[PDB]
Amino acid sequence: HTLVWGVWVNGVDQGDGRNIYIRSPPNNNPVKNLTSPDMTCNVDNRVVPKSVPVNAGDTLTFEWYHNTRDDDIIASSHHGPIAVYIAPAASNGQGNVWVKLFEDAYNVTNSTWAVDRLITAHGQHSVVVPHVAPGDYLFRAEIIALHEADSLYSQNPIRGAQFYISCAQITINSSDDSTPLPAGVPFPGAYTDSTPGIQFNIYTTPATSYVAPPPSVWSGALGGSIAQVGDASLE
């Protein structure tokens, strides 16, 4: 159970974004139905008043929270991968529009999933703003918690993969547009019961054998990281 408080840009806290520049759900319950419109931007998708100014090459850091800002973020049981997608606000999430800018499942070195490291990072994980057309965008961050993904939701609706999904509104001002955005996958749609990473047993199977759901990370992506970039406690 977790949600996004707001964002930092190049290490600068942009202030509470909830229902302002983040299209927030009313609470931190997971999305589990794979065919539902809720897979787009969670249970309350609608244009909100504000959109954060950034430029290509900026570092955009999402900040997640559990109950209060900078609390314990998400419960330690929710082991799983983290992804960020982008789409034009044009689309409002609809159609074949979502391009993946980032994916992080399991790190063999430190033997931590992305979620474990997100807790350590005080809920902060980042992506570098790519060189796409200036304009308005949604950045969709998605945490897949797999603590019950040994089952499928379609077959047993009290279990299944859990999706904690949050769309930010981002306006990209300066960009040379060296990497124009391609068409993407739809949500709902790209994840189905048969898609890998959706059904997996983290209790019996080892985390190095985990393979995150597709699609793959767009070549025009400029990476990202899971790590604290500013102290929320100083505000």
Ligand X SMILES: OC[C@H]1O[C@@H](O[C@H]2[C@H](O)[C@@H](O)[C@H](O[C@H]3[C@H](O)[C@@H](O)[C@H](O[C@H]4[C@H](O)[C@@H](O)[C@H](O)O[C@@H]4CO)O[C@@H]3CO)O[C@@H]2CO)[C@H](O)[C@@H](O)[C@@H]1O
Ligand Y SMILES: *[C@@H]1O[C@H](CO)[C@@H](O)[C@H](O)[C@H]1NC(C)=O
Q: Site residues (CB under 6 A) for ligand X? A: 1, 28, 66-67, 75, 77, 147-148
Was 164 annotated as part of a binding site?
Answer: yes
Q: How far is the CB of 228 from ligand X (least distance, A)?
A: 21
| Contact status: 35 vs ligand Y (CB under 6 A) | yes
Q: Which of 28, 33, 55, 151 binds ligand Y (CB under 6 A)?
A: 33
Interstrand relation of 224-226 and 112-113 (parallel, antiparallel or unpaired) = unpaired
Q: How far is CA 165 from CA 39, 51, 179, in A?
A: 7, 18, 26
Q: How far is the CB of 150 from ligand Y (least distance, A)?
A: 18
187: Cα separation from own chain's centroid: 13
Q: How far is the CB of 29 from ligand X (least distance, A)?
A: 7
Q: What are phi and psi of 60, to 5 degrees?
A: -105, 115
152: Cα separation from own chain's centroid: 21
Sign of CA dihedral 189, 37, 89, 83: negative
| Contact status: 147 vs Cu ion (CB under 5 A) | no
Cα–Cα nearest to 161, from 174, 186, 144, 178: 144
Which residue of the chain is nearest Cu ion when measured via CB?
Answer: 1
| Contact status: 1 vs Cu ion (CB under 5 A) | yes
Instruction: Determine the interface stretch with ligand Y among 32-40, 91-99, 158-166, 171-179 (rule: CB under 6 A).
Output: 32-40
Q: How far is the CB of 232 from ligand X (least distance, A)?
A: 18
DSSP category for residue 130: P
| CB closer to ligand Y, 31 vs 212 | 31
Was 110 annotated as part of a binding site?
Answer: no
Was 67 annotated as part of a binding site?
Answer: yes
Summarize the annotated binding site for O2 as residue ranges.
147, 162
Which residues contact Cu ion (rule: CB under 5 A)? 1
